[PDB]
């Protein structure tokens, strides 16, 4: 899926289709996560519902602001050795991004695995790509993922940042040469989310060891407004013995054999046939907000459903707020 | 000839498609069903001018749908044997001549085209022309043809015209 | 034969040239007795005049050792024994394209970037000039694909090859825009046989090539002629002699002064073949005999390479034309042309002769080692060239050839390809309607010198070329679909144009014949070269060359592509002189307003587009003291007589800022039109306004 980050092209980043190199990069991630199945090892968060939000009271939590971004695990193996992994398992080599070892600045990091997002940013009216490091799985083969989220959070600071800063102070690293900015997402204790609220939602992160796979205790909250599902749009005349063969816009989701829903087909909706259509929910209806040129297939069925489970039994912008404030007492 | 007649056609309405406004559904159903059609007795059904009369709805016994006999003023067209009609040339062939009259394809064979109008592929449009190069029948021209006979196939008519008699060819 | 004493295989190739020919070019009186007709000799063993007898017999013996061998066994041993075999065609249609890639590197890019005698490039990609080339005996045009791919559309190719299984496979040009190439098969043009040996094919092609090159000829000719000599491989020179002559005669017929030539040859032992090389050495500033590493080491295949065609080569061309007529008369007789230059003339040039012998003997010595190496690799099947993959990678790096597979283009849909070609430019720019020119909008054409105008004959559309007949149009509205163009025409991939469709009526009334033609109004992308930011006339200069590049004059069954005639707005008076009242087929005998083009064709005009070519804050004035136009910056108050780079109106400003003066009923633009509507601008109103605002 060779689009690396959508909205910009970035210097040096390149999909890796070389057969020997790719099988390696992927293999080593599964390895580092202690991961079972096929595909992406990365921890997968779940959407907050009225049942989940009870966990914010069961153990300690940290919270940060989600921005829509793209999910990339960054594998730092060596000197030009840096790679990036997709939700898809797509692998990309990054070129002039260099990570100094904190003890010896001449050395480089190896056997390190990072978790984070690629986000585009705005200052000058032009796009500045950024990699935000929100977790760390391995360091020097050291299994820092089994450590505690504050431990891991600190590690990322002194092991992956301070060093890249020192070498920038000296001009061994001209920030300018590197394909993108590199930063750690700051996280806050549970009690501080009230002061905070392209930032599309919240992330609620537990204090325990890193786990790959579906994580029922890592909660992504989105305001019910922004809830959206991607269907493939199929409109067909529908009057076989029916008097009016009015063409009807049907919406399709991945994994489901028959139609998921219906949209009322607008005069404008039609040219989007066969192409992914992005829909919101409002009136007990679906609505067309935009077109996506980045996928030839819809969301997973169980994804669409967990969208619905979210919209009908929602966690409200206000519901979340009372829950936090009470516990802040 | 472009005709303004009255025609009768029966519409079948299932009770799912009644609605609060019932008669507009029948009007939209008639504008859907018979517009753009072609029948052997009434020709190219171009459009429905004005839906004049809506009959009484006979509930068919055992069936659910109601049946409406409908009279309607309609614009139609019929091709005729021997009628001299204006036309747009779409293709000149060594075998014949593809022209159009409205939506109708009309095929004029060269064997019923006189010996003056020879075929030329060597011109950059392949065309019909004389050795005097005076009458040049090529693509996208305005011509006139005499319709000899019509053949209806798959609920649509095509025709065959000719240029043998006087004053036929280019306008 | 010890073949193990060969130098280590390398991507570094050496070129030895002939000396510079110090003799004058032979005239018709000097050459008057040079053509010796003798008995037809089919013996190569005694052709020792330009190679030592022991080497000639040794290479002939080493060839004939394979006559008893299975061809698939030979081919497999050869594939292991040749250090260069892994190069193949890479992404091109065949391995011949890679020979041209190799030789165009070795010869300082002289084919793809030809130079004058002062070392300046003869073609600049930003100027209105095209790289004209020819490719003869060249089916399926692998050599052409590399040149077209290397220069994109900034080139125009002309082809002649025999009709048959080895015709031009233009469909198979996956890496190049085949629309930039024009096959021509001699007499009858597209319907000819393509026989290079036949003179009439040469003559019709010759007139056609000179016409399609402003009567100058091509910058270079390539020639890759050869045919099967299966079971007579030792006689390949003698059998191909007339094809060699006709390719050399073609160079002197269509290459321009200072132009270049490259021709495949085989062995060069016969005085006939050496006399043909001597005539090229007389006719060019520099000649060499070269075997590229992309040629197989054990075959007689080499290239003659000629640089800088001299002035005054006409007598040698017309002599070789007479020799070809004589060879054609002697076909199937016991007589043949055995000399084209006397042996005493050739051997009188000791510097030419010493190079010719040394070139032949060096080639024989290398070919003998390479034949003995293949024989050893047939006898021992464990032998292999270990460096083939290393040498391949280095050759591709050196020649600037990307290491990628041959992929059929990808089929893009016209909407996705339009978004790729616009590179994130806002789509709404393509939806802008022209401002109507009316008495209320007439002031917008001030200052007059900032504007150009052109006569329209249909509504404006966008046109995208995806290669060959995959041409689509779009009417600029986001709701509208790309429609496939129902015209017999061809365009290179990665082409994005602003066009109209114009039917060109020929004659009048019943005899009138109208043919629709593509009329280019402006250009955005030409075969993957973006031109949108260039000045309107400068963009049009690139556009005008493109129409010739995609032209097909041997194919009168194809729909023509044209560029609109662009007028200066202060010269709009010249448009009305070309307006005539003509009797159109189907107008009931009523004359219609018709605009007559550069040829004997006319169309019914719909109106006149007025396009701004100068960007704000700049504008063009006329200096009465200097009698020259100048650019004035309204913000800084600066004035200059040179074109400011920021004064250039790019495509989006030209398109957005355009006016349209419609020519419907009630508008007087020709003196035979009555009545005039008083609310509508006449020719006289617009010309009066223009005259008041020229000063």
UniProtKB/TrEMBL annotation, chain B:
- Identify the residues that the record assigns to the S1 motif domain, covering every copy: 80-162
> Where would you find this protein in the cell?
Nucleus
In the UniProt record, the signal sequence range is none
> What InterPro entries does this protein's entry cite?
NA-bd_OB-fold, RNA_pol_Rpb7-like_N_sf, Rpb7-like, Rpb7-like_N, S1_domain
Which molecular-function annotations from GO does this UniProt entry contain? nucleic acid binding
What Pfam families does the annotation carry?
S1, SHS2_Rpb7-N
GO cellular component terms, semicolon-separated: DNA-directed RNA polymerase complex; nucleus
Q: A GO biological process this protein is involved in?
A: DNA-templated transcription initiation
The UniProt entry's sequence similarity note says:
Belongs to the eukaryotic RPB7/RPC8 RNA polymerase subunit family.
Listed name of the protein: DNA-directed RNA polymerase subunit
């Amino acid at each position: 899926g060779a689009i690396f980050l959508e909205g910009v092209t970035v210097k040096g980043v390149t999909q890796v289709t070389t057969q020997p190199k790719l099988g390696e990069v992927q293999q080593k991630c599964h390895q580092f996560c202690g991961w079972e199945g096929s595909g992406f090892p990365g921890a997968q968060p779940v959407s907050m519902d009225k049942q989940n939000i009870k966990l914010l009271d069961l153990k300690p939590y940290k919270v940060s602001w989600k921005a829509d971004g793209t999910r990339y695990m960054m594998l730092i193996d060596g000197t030009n050795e840096v790679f990036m992994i997709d939700r898809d398992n797509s692998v990309f080599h990054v070129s002039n991004l260099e990570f100094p070892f904190r003890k010896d600045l001449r050395m480089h990091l190896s056997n390190t695995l990072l978790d984070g997002e690629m986000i585009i940013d705005r200052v000058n009216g032009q796009a500045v790509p950024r990699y935000l490091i929100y977790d760390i799985i391995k360091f020097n083969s050291q299994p820092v993922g089994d450590c505690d989220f504050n431990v891991r959070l600190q590690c990322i600071e002194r092991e992956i940042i301070s060093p890249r800063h020192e070498k920038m102070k000296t001009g061994l690293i001209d920030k300018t040469q590197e394909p993108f900015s590199v930063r750690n997402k700051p996280f806050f204790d549970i009690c501080t989310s009230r002061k905070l609220l392209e930032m599309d939602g919240l992330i609620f992160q537990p204090t325990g060891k890193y786990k790959p796979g579906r994580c029922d205790d890592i909660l992504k909250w989105k305001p019910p407004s922004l809830n959206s599902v991607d269907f493939r749009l199929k409109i067909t005349r529908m009057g076989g013995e029916g008097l009016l063969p009015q063409n009807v816009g049907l919406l399709y989701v991945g994994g489901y054999e028959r139609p998921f829903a219906q949209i009322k087909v607008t005069k404008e909706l039609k040219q989007y046939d066969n192409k992914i259509i992005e829909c919101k929910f409002e009136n007990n209806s679906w609505v067309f907000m935009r077109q996506r040129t980045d996928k030839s297939f819809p969301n997973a069925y169980n994804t669409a459903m967990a969208v619905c489970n979210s919209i009908s039994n929602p966690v409200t912008k206000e519901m979340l707020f009372e829950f936090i404030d009470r516990c802040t007492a | 000839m472009f005709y303004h007649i009255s025609l009768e056609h029966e519409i079948l309405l299932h009770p799912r498609y009644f609605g609060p406004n019932l008669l507009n559904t029948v009007k939209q159903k008639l504008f859907t069903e018979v517009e753009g059609t072609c029948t052997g007795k009434y020709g190219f059904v171009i459009a429905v001018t004005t839906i004049d009369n809506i009959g009484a709805g006979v509930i068919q016994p055992g069936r659910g749908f109601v049946l409406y006999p409908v009279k309607y003023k309609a614009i139609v067209f019929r091709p005729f044997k021997g009628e001299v009609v204006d036309a747009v040339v779409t293709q000149v062939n060594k075998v014949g001549l593809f022209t159009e009259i409205g939506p109708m394809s009309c095929f004029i064979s060269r064997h019923s085209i006189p010996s003056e109008m020879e075929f030329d592929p060597n011109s950059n449009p392949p065309c019909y022309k004389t050795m005097d190069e005076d009458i040049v029948i090529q693509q996208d021209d305005e011509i006139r043809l005499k319709i000899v006979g019509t053949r209806v196939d798959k609920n649509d008519i095509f025709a065959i015209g000719s240029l043998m008699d006087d004053y036929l060819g280019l306008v | 034969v010890d073949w193990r004493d060969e130098p280590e295989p390398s991507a570094c190739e050496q070129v030895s040239w002939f000396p510079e020919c110090t003799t004058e070019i032979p005239d018709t009186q000097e050459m008057s007795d040079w053509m010796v007709v003798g008995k037809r000799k089919m013996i190569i063993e005694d052709e020792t005049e330009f190679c030592g007898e022991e080497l000639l017999h040794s290479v002939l013996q080493c060839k004939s050792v394979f006559d008893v061998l299975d061809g698939e066994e030979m081919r497999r041993a050869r594939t292991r024994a040749n250090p260069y075999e892994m190069i193949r065609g890479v992404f091109f249609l065949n391995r011949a394209a890679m020979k041209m890639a190799n030789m165009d590197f070795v010869f300082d890019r002289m084919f793809t970037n030809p130079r004058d005698s002062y070392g300046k490039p003869l073609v600049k990609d930003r100027e209105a000039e095209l790289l004209y080339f020819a490719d003869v005996c060249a089916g399926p045009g692998g050599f052409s694909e590399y040149v077209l791919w290397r220069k994109k559309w900034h080139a125009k190719g002309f082809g002649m090859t025999l009709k048959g299984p080895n015709d031009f496979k233009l469909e198979d040009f996956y890496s190049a825009s085949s629309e930039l190439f024009e096959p021509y098969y001699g007499e009858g043009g597209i319907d000819g046989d393509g026989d290079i040996t036949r003179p009439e094919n040469i003559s019709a092609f010759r007139n056609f090539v000179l016409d399609n090159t402003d009567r100058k000829g091509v910058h270079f000719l390539m020639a890759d002629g050869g045919f099967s000599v299966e079971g007579q491989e030792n006689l390949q020179e003698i059998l191909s002699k007339q094809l060699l002559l006709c390719q050399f005669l073609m160079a002197l017929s269509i290459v321009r002064t200072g132009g270049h030539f490259i021709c495949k040859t085989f062995d060069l032992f016969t005085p006939f073949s050496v006399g043909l090389v001597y005539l090229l050495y007389c006719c060019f500033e520099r000649v060499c005999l070269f075997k590229p590493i992309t040629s197989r080491p054990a075959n007689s295949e080499r290239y003659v390479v000629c640089k800088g065609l001299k002035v005054g080569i006409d007598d040698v061309r017309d002599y070789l034309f007479a020799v070809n007529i004589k060879l054609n008369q002697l076909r199937n007789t016991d007589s043949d042309v055995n000399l084209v230059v006397p042996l005493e003339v050739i051997k009188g040039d000791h510097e030419f002769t010493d190079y010719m012998i040394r070139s032949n003997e060096s080639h024989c010595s290398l070919q003998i080692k390479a034949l003995a190496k293949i024989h050893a690799f047939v006898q021992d099947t464990t032998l292999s060239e270990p460096r083939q993959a290393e040498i391949r990678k280095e050759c591709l790096r050196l020649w600037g050839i990307p290491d990628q597979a041959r992929v059929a283009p990808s089929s893009s849909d016209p909407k996705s390809k339009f978004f790729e070609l616009i590179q994130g430019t806002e789509i709404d720019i393509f939806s802008y309607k022209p401002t109507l020119l009316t008495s209320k909008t007439l002031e917008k054409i001030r200052p007059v010198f900032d504007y150009r105008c052109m006569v329209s004959g249909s509504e404006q559309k966008f046109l995208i070329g995806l290669g060959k007949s995959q041409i689509y149009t779009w009417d600029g509205r986001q709701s509208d679909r790309w429609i496939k163009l129902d015209l017999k025409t061809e365009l290179p991939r990665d082409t994005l144009l602003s066009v109209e469709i114009v039917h060109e009526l020929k004659g009048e009334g019943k005899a009138q014949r109208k043919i629709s033609a593509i009329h280019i109004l402006d250009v955005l992308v030409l075969n993957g070269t973006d031109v949108r930011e260039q000045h309107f006339n400068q963009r049009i200069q690139l556009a005008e060359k493109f129409v010739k590049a995609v032209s097909k004059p041997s194919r009168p069954d194809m729909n023509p592509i044209r560029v609109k005639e662009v007028y200066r707005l202060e010269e709009m008076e010249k448009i009305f002189v070309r307006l005539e009242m003509k009797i159109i087929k189907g107008s009931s005998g009523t004359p219609k307003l018709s605009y007559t083009g550069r040829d004997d064709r006319h169309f019914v005009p719909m109106g006149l587009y007025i396009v701004r070519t100068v960007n704000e804050p700049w504008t063009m004035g006329f200096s009465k003291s200097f009698k020259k136009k100048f650019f004035y910056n309204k913000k800084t108050k600066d004035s200059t007589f040179d074109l400011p780079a920021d004064s250039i109106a790019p495509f989006h400003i030209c398109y957005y800022g355009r006016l349209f003066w419609e020519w419907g009923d009630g508008i007087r633009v020709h003196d035979s039109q009555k009545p005039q509507d008083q609310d509508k601008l006449s020719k006289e109103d617009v010309l009066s306004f223009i005259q008041m605002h020229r000063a």
